[PDB]
């Protein structure tokens, strides 16, 4: 016979521990053919790559230059609660990194003209207050009458290699990368009897370098 001795932690069940199961079915099973079923998913990041609406930002002809239409911090307080598919993948895990792809779809008329400047400012104690102060970061002046959607890349200008997904401490050094905001560059113009307003649908999805790790309890107890 072999001699043995039990280490501390006998009879303990671990979610990450392998080789605990005993066979409750005797015979070798054969699953029916399933190659006819398309759209086979294998990764959580594929969900994050799918588009997801985050904000419906309105824009009228009455809006003057340097008018803020929207602003959100790039922190687990916002990016994890947009309702987009990417926000669900972020909330499942504790750390994230890589670029974020923003898509501003102009759902106005073909007769409308104007410009909206989309600014991304890295982390700071205070968010940008004016348009010109926000334009000191990475921005793109987007002319709405070209292609329907704007392809704005949110660069990962970050202090560390990973950012924590903690909703209790969103403004931490190791959590937020900064702010992204929409300002009116050139006022919305168009011929008479055209619509006086035009909606801009803001989508958010994962970039090609976006990653996530360290799984956490989903749902969250938030607030």
């Amino acid at each position: 016979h072999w001699k043995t001795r039990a280490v501390p932690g006998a009879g303990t069940f671990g979610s990450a521990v392998a080789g605990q199961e005993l066979p409750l079915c005797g015979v070798r099973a054969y699953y029916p053919p399933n190659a006819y079923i398309p759209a086979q998913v294998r990764d959580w990041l594929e969900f994050a790559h799918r588009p997801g609406l985050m904000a419906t930002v309105p824009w009228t002809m009455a809006d003057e230059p340097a008018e803020r239409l929207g602003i959100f911090p790039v922190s687990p307080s916002a990016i994890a609660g947009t309702g987009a598919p990417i926000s669900y993948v972020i909330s499942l895990f504790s750390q994230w990194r890589g670029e974020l792809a923003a898509h501003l779809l102009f759902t106005g008329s073909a007769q409308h003209y104007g410009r909206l400047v989309v600014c991304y400012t890295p982390a700071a104690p205070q968010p940008p207050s004016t348009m010109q102060e926000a334009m000191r970061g990475t921005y793109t002046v987007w002319d709405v009458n070209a292609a329907s959607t704007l392809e704005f890349t949110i660069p990962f200008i970050s202090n560390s290699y990973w950012k924590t997904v903690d909703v209790n401490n969103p403004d931490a050094l190791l959590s937020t990368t900064g702010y992204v905001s929409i300002w009116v560059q050139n006022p919305l113009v168009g011929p008479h009897t055209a619509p006086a307003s035009a909606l801009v649908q803001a989508f958010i999805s994962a970039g090609e370098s976006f990653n996530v790790r360290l799984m956490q309890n989903p749902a969250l107890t938030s607030q």
Binding site: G11, F13, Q20, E21, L22, P23, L24, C25, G26, R28, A29, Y31, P32, P33, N34, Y36, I37
Partner: peptide, 28 residues
Amino acid sequence: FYMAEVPVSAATSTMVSFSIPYTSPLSA
């Protein structure tokens, strides 16, 4: 059926792990 007889201790809970392969008659 393929059964298992688990001894349960007194005044406490007992744990046991099982493994079952994909036995469904459906493809998925």
